Scaffold this active site. Structure first.
Site: not given
Ligand code: FE
Ligand code: FE
Ligand code: FE
Ligand code: FE
Lengths: 200, 233, 233, 200, 233, 200, 200
Positions: E105, E144, E154, E157, E159
């Site tokens: 991110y 991740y 995770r 995905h 958001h």
């Molecule tokens: Fe996330």
């Protein structure tokens, strides 16, 4: 294994229990004969006492809709199951807290000692069943008297409570009300000082 | 006075609703966080009142006359009270309360906008007979909204209180009526994890007992904890 | 004036109740012995009144206010009127009558012992909106006994009359409430031989439409005969 | 095959149909606007007539609880679908037989002629729908006039009825009531002289 | 100003993840313990911002260009926003954020070893069109690892935040990718109790929306609370 | 019963919510127009106020990754739904808390009075929605003003909160920040002083 | 709903019912004690009467294989259930119709009045059950006397018969046989003047 018929499942008494089981408290016309909070006629043997308490929820807020059933031995430690308003003493009674009065009251006599199955005596206690909205299955508890420390210390039942801090929740605190012997028994359903409830 | 002759089959706490059933909002702050302490049965728990001598009014069990006639479906609610062994529970106190046909309760706090019924009180009591049978004559109560979820409605129900032979057997429950669609959505009903348990709370229509051209009948049998004689104790 | 522009799908008379259904006693003598004569659809049959300009009173559809407040379960009965093709039926007359909460009708001949309600008449009417939506506000009626078999009881029901676009679509029916156990027993309901059809008379509880803290809602969709344009006639 | 949504199943009108659809006949207060038995106001064009009849069951006993809906064309053979009490004529009306009045009555005008889908004229008729207790699905019939024998003879609909004797059952008998032109249309639901009922 | 003319279908809080879902660690301390207080809808709840006038930049919805080209699987994520009744929600704000191809991110707080992509920022916003459709272009994010369980990953995905008509409908969610073997294993995912609800969060490969020789597509439809007009209030 | 499509299930906003909903706050380049915390521009009617607060977890720790959304009426009690940066006042705003700033702020005006669906005026209030990692479904609450006791007393919403104490969680406390009128509204997700969160 | 065991299903009595229920009538040796058609002994109080009748099938043909059972109150309106050959009166009897005698006869006394469950007097009547080959389940009916109009008009049972004409099927017509008071009651199973058969 052997399996019997399952018992009918319990349900909360809900908010209006009073109209069914506590006419007067509800402020509704009552019948000729009602099961109320006066277990003892002034002419009943034993120490006439007034029991009073408040019920608190887990937030520390009063429970103004509870219904309580009490079962106790008479002064002799005998359970008087033949209920009659004619009787000077009935082993059973009912009380409640309401928006009008956040505190219940019971007019009775202090119960005598009864022995457990094994023949061991239990401290004087009033078996209480608490009902109210939010309670799915009634809570069974026992009100013991602060003035029975001695008896209390050996109650087979009280002793089953692992933690002593907890046993205290079961002890009513003696006071006077208009010159009468009263015991305050606050029930804390949840949280800090949560009252012990039993399964039997 | 009462005798410690009996033992009651242990309650199945997985059958009955648990204390904390969050969807039932009020249960959150009114459910104990500590485990229940189990205790052996003693006379304290194995006895209870016998109401054989309560002076029941003549209309005690007849909600149609005990409060003009009420407005609503006239019914007889009858059944038998037996224990887990299937043995009848004679002369036991069955008390009931309910709302009017509108779901209004004759109680100050009930501010539901459904009106009170001038000829309906909603309270009854009956002592089972020698065979464990009871019966009431009332009107079928209406569902009613309640501040839980934003749109929660209780199924029509009659609140029941049954004494049984002991405080161990005392139960308050709610009778629901066969087929009520509100049943499965009620967070109160759902406080019961086993669907087989829920079943037990549903009164069945009983045409056999109806008074033709007068009133219907619902059969609600109650099963109180099995009572056995003590053995080898 | 009205115009013959539509055909309505033929009625499935095996789907609808037959005329002679002996168990429904009155039908024995009030059912024709001869076969219905089938006739093709004409303007006589494919047209009908449009009630768009009936001066409906302000509470015509509100049984709660159109006669104090009535005693009983406050519900909204809403739904849509569609045809077999799934098209909405806008501005249609939906009339309904029912008993009070007790099963008593406000009619001279109803001598059932359930009392009349001084604030309830039990009659309503509503015109569907642009989307075929209608809605009534009333109270849930009670079942009532009737002299059929010695112990016959009608399930709670609301009588409905739907105009639809024509006299071919006009239907009188009865809505039954989801889950009513009386349903399967009704010789009148049983006049319907196919179980799937019976299902169609069953209003479903509709929580999405209820007014929280006020009233429940039942959804009763009505399917009237499909209307199609004429083709190749 | 292609199956559409099934039509909602019919059910009898039951014994209290009056209250819902015949306020006045039921002897209950009426609303401002009621759909009743006066299709025509005094100043509506056409020949003002009075229709009356009785309904018989299979045993020859009167049906005192029927509800009839009628649909007819105006005097011009036009179907006035926009229902309005202001209107001088409404195509739609309602009537009934009751315990008070075993005979129904309608005030209208004799209807004009309308054509069938195929363009063929139908004899003046009034489409009747009979409802009552005992009738699961309404009965559709038509009221033809005895004073219209010719039209009647060519009616494509009347003609669909195989047996001539049966067609008779659909013709109302002209009479005079208080010197008013009247037609008597007796319906015999079952039995000897059983009225023809249609399906469409 | 906004007006109170709508009502929203009460949320089914048993469908949505509950507050407390312990396998998802952070929820432990960030979940209320008191029951939510149900309040009637009023103007305050039934209204919300309309984003119609916000000045969107041209690449606001195109992550491939809004920040060289990013490295990773080029995908389009598209779908429709509807209400429970199946009604489209137009001009509603849809915002999304995600990681890069390697699960990184563009936030200071992200120290995953997979490098940032000099050409990727990972934010987008899109106002739904008249039919409730939105679309984004981005790269499929990589799974991740996160500090939940010792080997929690995770599933890939994206958001999502969706305004809806009122603040009553506003929602934040996450989209997962069809077949990701990580899905059934995610505690976040698992906060949702009904497998059926989970399925609602799985974007399906949409070969139909892909750009041949360019990028793949995934379909993600969003259902917001049903909006209804007030009745008999 | 009738069942609609089920709503898409909520999912936590996760830790990176800021990159997507609070860019500046994330310290990432922002776009041209961003929804931020300045609801009113200097020349907006009503009384200009600063709102600020902190968010606490059930451990009493600052939630440094929360994101909040607010909805309020303007000074004349009207909801300005049309969001635009050119407006003097926007009914909607966003704020956040970050590792960098653990206190969120909002620049707005004290909202005017609005009525409930029943016609009863509600005390001036700000609607808030809170999102953060760990929050599976966002929480709704209201910010009331303490200098409005009269109004607050009769608010039909505040009055739904059974417990008066619980009501207080919603009252923002008036203060001054660089000699400017401010109100502080702290949120406690869980635990002691847990803020009332609604469901509607 | 609650379902009980289902009642054994009825079956027709078949053609030889007489050999098992009407021996004499069958012309088979009888047993010492038979249940037959002499309900009253000469000396039984009340007005002695002879009941006689025939049974007709749907086609108007005699039923010469019927078996009937009657139940009636004695002259005082009392039901004599204890069946005994010695009694001067038995509330029960059997009779039949055979190929030898197609008319049944019963020697009894005019029944007194009995009240219905609601307390209303029913006109004097004889309860009858008819059996025969062809009848899957027996038919119930009542015999009423023509010389009791007053009472008949007020009978709550007779008054349940919707149609007055139907009520008449139930009225036995007075006559005299050998100067003896008689009443003829003919039964019509089916068809014209079909006797009212009850369900109870
Ligand atoms: Fe996330
Ligand atoms: Fe209740
Ligand atoms: Fe009816
Ligand atoms: Fe045989």
């Amino acid at each position: 294994p052997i399996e019997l018929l399952p018992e009918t499942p319990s349900q909360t008494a809900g908010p209006y229990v009073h109209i069914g089981l506590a006419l007067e408290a509800a402020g509704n016309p009552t019948r000729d004969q009602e099961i109320w909070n006066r277990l003892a006629k002034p002419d009943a043997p034993g120490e006439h006492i007034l029991l009073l308490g408040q019920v608190y929820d887990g937030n520390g807020h009063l429970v103004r809709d509870s219904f309580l059933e009490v079962w106790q031995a008479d002064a002799n430690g005998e359970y008087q199951d033949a209920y009659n308003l004619e009787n000077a003493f009935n082993s059973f009674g009912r009380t409640a807290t309401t928006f009008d009065a956040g505190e219940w009251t019971l007019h009775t006599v202090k119960p005598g000692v009864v022995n457990n199955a094994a023949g061991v005596p239990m401290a004087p206690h009033i078996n209480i069943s608490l009902f109210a909205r939010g309670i799915n299955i009634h809570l069974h508890t026992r009100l013991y008297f602060d003035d029975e420390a001695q008896a209390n210390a050996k109650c087979p039942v009280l002793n089953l409570i692992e933690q002593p801090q907890r046993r205290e929740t079961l002890i009513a605190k003696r006071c006077e009300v208009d010159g009468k012997t009263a015991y305050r028994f606050d029930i804390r359903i949840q949280g800090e000082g949560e009252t012990v409830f039993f399964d039997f | 006075p009462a005798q410690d002759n009996s033992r009651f089959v242990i309650r199945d706490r997985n059958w009955h609703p648990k204390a904390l059933t969050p969807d039932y909002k009020t249960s959150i702050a009114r459910s104990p966080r500590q485990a229940l302490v189990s205790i052996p049965q003693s006379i304290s728990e194995t006895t209870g009142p016998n109401f054989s001598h309560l002076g029941f009014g003549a209309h005690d069990h007849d909600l149609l006359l005990n409060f003009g006639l009420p407005i609503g479906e006239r019914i007889i609610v009858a059944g038998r009270v037996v224990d887990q062994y299937g043995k009848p529970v004679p002369n036991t106190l069955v008390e009931m309360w309910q709302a009017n046909a509108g779901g209004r309760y004759r109680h100050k706090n009930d501010r539901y906008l459904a009106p009170l019924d001038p000829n309906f009180g909603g309270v009854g009591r009956c002592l089972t007979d020698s065979d464990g049978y009871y019966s009431f004559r009332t009107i079928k109560p209406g569902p009613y909204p309640w501040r839980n979820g934003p749109n929660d409605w209780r199924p029509a129900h009659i609140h029941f209180g049954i004494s049984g032979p002991s405080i161990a057997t005392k139960l308050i429950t709610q009778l629901y009526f066969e087929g009520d669609p509100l049943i499965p959505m009620c967070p109160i009903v759902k406080s019961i994890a086993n669907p087989e348990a829920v079943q037990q709370l549903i009164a069945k229509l009983d045409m056999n007992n109806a008074n033709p051209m007068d009133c219907l009948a619902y059969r609600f049998d109650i099963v109180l904890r099995g009572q056995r004689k003590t053995h080898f104790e």
